[PDB]
Design a protein around this ligand. Structure first.
Ligand SMILES: NC(=O)C1=CN([C@@H]2O[C@H](COP(=O)(O)OP(=O)(O)OC[C@H]3O[C@@H](n4cnc5c(N)ncnc54)[C@H](OP(=O)(O)O)[C@@H]3O)[C@@H](O)[C@H]2O)C=CC1
Ligand SMILES: Nc1nc2c(ncn2[C@@H]2O[C@H](COP(=O)(O)OP(=O)(O)O)[C@@H](O)[C@H]2O)c(=O)[nH]1
Lengths: 333, 338, 332, 332
């Protein structure tokens, strides 16, 4: 029975990771500064919530002293790229300096602690190779990305300089029913469900050609745990290795939702018609439609599949189905 | 008339940059954390102490930085400050990040808000290459920091790039390799060597204790490097440049050439950590390697390829390694003769 | 409609201040759902925004974006006990946090009116009885020490940059919005339940503890009054009189149908309802602390003279407002 | 042998304390440049003091230091001690002179509680004096971010004594100069100036308020007081001053004499000018440029308690001091 400490406990990954660790018999302490996610997973009463703020050092030190964890998963952050352009300094304090604060607190009070840093594919920014691996040169394109890159390297440096068990997971996009409404995958499934129940009329999106490497969040936090259970600390890219367009997602979700969508038109004037009603379910707005991105983010996780035995167990279709089902259920109630 | 704001004004680079811009008709405002009665010594030694306006601006106080930009309204800002000590960064990692990484973003953000048309130069370092991924290293060599200082600087470099690409601000990042001068700080091997030999020749000192005499370094002449900073800032489009000599020399060579200039015919008797420098001239021991500094042969060779600087800025090393060693040794022999 | 910014919006004071400011035509921005805002019916009228007192830049942009005319710093890590365990964190919010706001205003909008929420805790080892603005401070906890910094840095920004910065030294104030962890709500809320079977007995601490208790709505009004004066100044906001935890339990119990008779002493004191001859109130070693030697009571006359402020609710009415309110809640 | 850890080792008081403690057989460890240790060199102890890197802002760094040094006595003499800079960098000043004190205390509490601790408090905390002279009992009234931050360091030190039972002292020292005094302060300015004005390396001397009555003492004697109170059976706070005041004007007069000058104070106000009644050449001007935001007029302390309990008292005379400083600079 080990003790794990999860920052960002209220988010998609913290929630699912909490679930996973509890099933493996851990005592789970969620760092926070009630959560609808822990509750939806039915574990809000088994997750021990304690205070901790990555913005200040002394409270982190004391939290480690009191909790004495075996494993610390830092999934906490200001993860919105957009916001980071407006609040770059605050973003840096949490996503960059905050990472160091924990490492320095573990170095100072409990050096035998395992540390996982939640890195992102956003660090590859203007991709230097396709697909991307642990050896692909980084090229951040937003304050958020630059702060994350800092967190990455500072985690590698503490591993090399103090021989601490510090891992860095360079994770690519991963969704789930607990995904924020702010995200395209959830927006699509949430919206479609509502439309099917008259609570909404049309699904308004951006470029339907945008491509992403989408995975199933539960399987991703599992890779986090896997990294942490190895004899030697290392960093891994975690992704599916394939990309899909926003159109494939809408299209497949609309299908599961019962619609018989049939695209027509192109560009900003694209539309999806439900051949079951004859009305337009989806349409593109200039408000969202942005320039087709030449840089393609898709990771090559063979290193993780190799050393960790990790591998996606959900196909893109299964993921789309899971999310659409969950949201068809949510809207009914 | 143009006006420049230089952080770390009282340091080696800041002092030379100030001297250079003053010669170009610039109005020079500066700021340095190190104050006191001997702090502006580099400014006194170059004779520009009364030609530089010193203001208070700490890289950790955002409101102070903002007020400074508002009041000074600079045309060019050169961020040359920093707690530039690799060693100390392990003992003060967060403070190091707050100054060398976030301090960069504080200046940029106050510039974007107060006077967005201000040119900005960030003093990045070859330390960001750390475990060199390519030999030599160019602007394209993947970075691999090996210390909180290197990692912070990496943030400082990228945040600078991002502001150039995202806000179309004129922001430059100069990746400079070691550059020495008589103004270099005693802490560095170069001043340590010359300042020590000078004290040895004049009997004020016993011996010179160093680390591995095989350590290779790409040493350049400071005055030429700050000139490269000004060059970058005068280009139509901002960019980043590797500024180095492109060739290395061993700490041993530096001691030898320097020893002579001081009146010593050094002969190297020993192996590695047992190596010793005996002046045939008097059969006495001048140099010995203490295990206190020694470090096994480094597999990583830090050597920069400044060909891009040559092509766009028309910049290249002019002073020679022998001229550099000589310039430094003479400056300290002179300092000791007082 | 003037624009106001309130840190600590979800707390008792923040909730009541926002209601007072809204009735007066203000645009209210609250820095941080909250059951209090919803209970006052102003949840949809308070514009919620983000602001963290532990970091400086986010505060700057918030001021540059809201351009508030009045700022009320009611946010804080206000737990003496917890402050002994987290002294540094406490200082960063209750001491440096105040300076971060003031420094933001000074840098971006100097004509902004600023109110700092100080506490009688700064009198700690009371140097006079009662305590006034002229009473020497003597903080007895990291919390009180931090708040003291908050008070003085506020005085210094007024005198150095000539800013309209006020500091109100407020004593205890209660209301139906007080948290259950506080003695007064615990009393009324408990009695209500006991009256409807939901609970068995009320377990308190030293029933001899004496306190200067006021009505929160009147205290946040003094805050606003301070901010409307010609000149900025500091004021002690209190009732000037005190009562024991016993008087409170008793008066409330009488509103809850009980008829308490006190038997026992110190840690062995117990209250009995004659009407039903049963032990309702009892003291336990868990909540028992010796009778504070530092008698905390404020003389609010300066507030009368310059603000024309004074308590307008009796201790009895305060107990009634709370007891009645929690009886209604328990029913529904 | 006794082991002491001093912060601000290269500062004025830090250097003298190092000298004195070495003289008493202590192992000295100091935390804090190519000429930075110029003070240690001047007192020729530069090689008897072990230097370690510890910054008042890096808590983890402070902990490792106590852990590595295991000091018996800790004297915190480091600080961003510039009332002026204080207004330009109020947050940084607080983090170092206020929270910085707390980080040490907290590091001592958890790594080595039995360590004696000394906080370098200051008379600047009395600001707009509430009594004349000022004693340990004179209510404080800070007039700058520096003063306010220090006030926190004082109270936080007191609280760690009273609450955690630690040996924590707070020395409320009044202004004290020496030849090592920083060139930023008025005293070292005047003497460093005249050794120039009257040497053709400068014209005149521009000063601000030539009326600020100041209690001036001799640095070496004041650091003696620190060691003394730290040696008492019980920790406590003490006021350390000469109990005698002299205006900046009065200081210049004598300070100039030791170089050849006969004041001719002509003109009251910003138009005040002091000419040499000898070579008939004006050598002293004025300018609002040197008038502080919230100035502290009179400052005179009553070191009566230090006398009774520590036996401490000022020896060097005001003139002896002016002489000491004026000569070391004439020489330089
Ligand atoms: N989702 C993805 O597809 C990918 C995510 N990641 C990264 O993985 C991590 C977890 O992902 P996910 O759950 O979706 O992200 P979230 O955005 O949900 O995680 C943010 C969490 O951080 C907490 N938090 C914010 N500031 C602080 C602070 N100062 N101190 C402590 N906690 C704080 C938040 O709490 P509160 O609610 O109180 O603000 C919230 O629970 C993030 O760091 C993200 O950047 C990387 C690659 C892909
Ligand atoms: N620094 C400084 N202080 C001056 C000057 N002229 C007058 N003063 C006053 O001298 C007094 C003492 O100044 P200083 O030695 O710097 O000490 P401090 O006031 O304790 O920081 C203050 O009240 C100043 O306002 C001047 O030119 N420089």
């Amino acid at each position: 029975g080990k003790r794990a400490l999860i920052t960002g406990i209220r988010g998609q990954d913290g929630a699912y990771l909490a679930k996973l660790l509890l099933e493996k018999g851990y005592e789970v302490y969620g760092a926070d500064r009630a959560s609808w996610r822990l509750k939806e997973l039915g574990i809000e009463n088994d997750v021990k919530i304690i205070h901790m703020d990555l913005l200040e050092f002394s409270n982190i030190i004391r939290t480690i002293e009191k909790v004495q964890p075996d494993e610390v998963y830092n999934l906490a952050a200001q993860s919105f790229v957009g916001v980071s352009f407006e609040q770059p300094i605050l973003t840096a304090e949490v996503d960059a300096i905050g990472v160091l604060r924990i490492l320095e607190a573990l170095r100072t009070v409990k050096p035998d602690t395992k540390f996982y840093q939640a890195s992102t594919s956003e660090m590859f920014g203007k991709v230097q190779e396709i697909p991307q691996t642990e050896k692909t040169p980084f090229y951040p394109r937003s304050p958020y990305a630059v702060a994350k890159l800092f967190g990455h390297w500072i985690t590698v440096n503490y591993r090399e300089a103090y021989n601490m068990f510090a891992c860095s997971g360079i994770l690519f996009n991963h969704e789930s029913p607990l995904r924020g409404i702010e995200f395209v995958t959830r927006k699509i499934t949430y919206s479609l469900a509502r439309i099917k129940y008259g609570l909404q009329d049309k699904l308004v999106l951006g470029n339907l050609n945008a491509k992403r490497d989408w995975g199933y969040a539960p399987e991703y936090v599992e890779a986090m745990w896997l990294m942490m259970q190895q004899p030697e600390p290392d960093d891994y890219v975690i992704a599916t290795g394939e990309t899909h367009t926003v159109r494939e997602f809408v299209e497949k979700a609309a299908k599961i939702a019962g619609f018989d969508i049939e695209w027509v038109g192109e560009g900003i004037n694209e539309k999806g018609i439900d051949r079951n009603t004859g009305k337009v379910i989806v349409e593109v707005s200039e408000e969202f439609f942005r320039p087709a991105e030449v840089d393609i983010l898709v990771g090559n996780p063979e290193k993780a599949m190799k050393k960790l035995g990790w591998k996606p167990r959900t196909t893109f279709d299964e993921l789309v189905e899971i999310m659409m089902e969950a949201d068809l259920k949510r809207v009914r109630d």
